[PDB]
């Protein structure tokens, strides 16, 4: 199906980091396993260590939104939608996509950061004071079960495309058409999963469960976000991310 080929190529063009790239790397990355190694990484690769780390998260968040936006625009049909719908889908979709794609750079030990040249451990993140330690853990939890599906980039591209073109985001104008868009993408995905993962012909419905879990993961994230907004002064939230979260 040509739709699979376009989305995949759009995803390779638009996402600087992808799974095969991240796996080749994890197969020489710098390891932030402690403060001493944190500071060293802040010398080369990119105020409390905690809020520093947080700020780095926001930077990465913003870059990925930009890339998701550009990826969206390259999805057949997307640019032909009304603007308020292009905005709506992105608004409600970026964080599900972000956390789905975050899985590609996480193993049980930690996650790649600084465009791949850094690696921050899961443990070191958990050692952090509250609530900042509660930020990455649920994402690591999601990632482990997600990576267990062993999707590749050709799968993930379609999965992210489906997250984005989602007929049930609140406030859509042309729902009928967006439903059909999603149907077409979901269709490509299912068949693609059937040819690319014959060993689990029910991998498709499992990914639908993943979608549900992403919606719940993100909801919980926004709450922790709202907590950190009200706890820590010195942890300012980037106005772009703040706009994304507004009335979400």
Ligand X SMILES: CC(C)(Oc1ccc(CCOc2ccc(/N=N/c3ccccc3)cc2)cc1)C(=O)O
Contacts to ligand X by CB under 6 A = 32, 41-42, 45-46, 53, 56-58, 60-61, 98, 102, 113-114, 118, 120, 135, 225, 241
Q: How far is the CB of 229 from ligand X (least distance, A)?
A: 9
Q: Residue 102 or residue 203: which is nearer to ligand X going by CB?
A: 102
192 contacts 151 by C-beta, under 8 angstroms:
no
Nearer to ligand X among residue 10 and residue 53 (C-beta): 53
Closest approach, Cβ 197 to ligand X, in A, equals 27
Q: How far is the CB of 114 from ligand X (least distance, A)?
A: 4
Is the CB of 87 or the CB of 240 nearer to ligand X?
240
Of 46 and 167, CB closest to ligand X: 46
Nearest distance from residue 191's CB to ligand X, in Å?
31
* Minimum gap (Å) between residue 135 Cβ and ligand X: 5
Q: CB of 124 within 8 A of CB of 110?
A: yes
Q: 95 a known binding residue?
A: yes
Q: Which is nearer to ligand X, 70 or 82 (CB)?
A: 70
* ω into 131 cis (within 30 of 0): yes
Shortest CB 179 distance to ligand X, Å: 28
Output the six-digit token pair for 2. Answer: 């040509």
Is 32 or 97 the residue whose CB approaches ligand X more closely?
A: 32
- Annotated binding residues for indeglitazar, written as ranges, equal 61, 95, 245
- Annotated binding residues, written as ranges, equal 61, 95, 245
């Amino acid at each position: 199906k040509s739709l699979a080929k376009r989305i995949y190529e759009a995803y390779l063009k638009n996402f600087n980091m992808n799974k095969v790239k991240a796996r080749v790397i994890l197969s020489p990355p710098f390891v932030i396993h402690d403060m001493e190694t944190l500071c060293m990484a802040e010398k080369t690769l990119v105020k409390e260590a905690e809020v520093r780390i947080f700020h780095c998260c926001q930077c990465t968040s913003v870059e990925t939104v930009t890339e998701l936006t550009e990826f969206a625009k390259a999805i057949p049909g997307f640019a032909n939608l009304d603007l308020n719908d292009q905005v709506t889908l992105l608004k409600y979709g970026v964080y599900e996509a972000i956390f789905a794609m975050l899985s590609s750079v996480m193993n049980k030990d930690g996650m790649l950061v600084a465009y791949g040249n850094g690696f921050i451990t899961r443990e070191f993140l958990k050692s952090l004071r509250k609530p900042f330690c509660d930020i990455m853990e649920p994402k690591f939890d999601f990632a482990m079960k997600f990576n267990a599906l062993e999707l590749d980039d050709s799968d993930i591209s379609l999965f992210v495309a489906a997250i984005i073109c989602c007929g049930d985001r609140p406030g859509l104008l042309n729902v009928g058409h967006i439903e059909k868009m999603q149907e077409g993408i979901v269709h490509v995905l299912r068949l693609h999963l059937q040819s690319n993962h014959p060993d689990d012909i029910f991998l498709f419905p499992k990914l639908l469960q993943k979608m549900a879990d992403l919606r719940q993961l993100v909801t919980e994230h926004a709450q922790l976000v709202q907590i950190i907004k009200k706890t820590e002064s010195d942890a300012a939230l980037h106005p772009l991310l703040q706009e994304i979260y507004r009335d979400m």
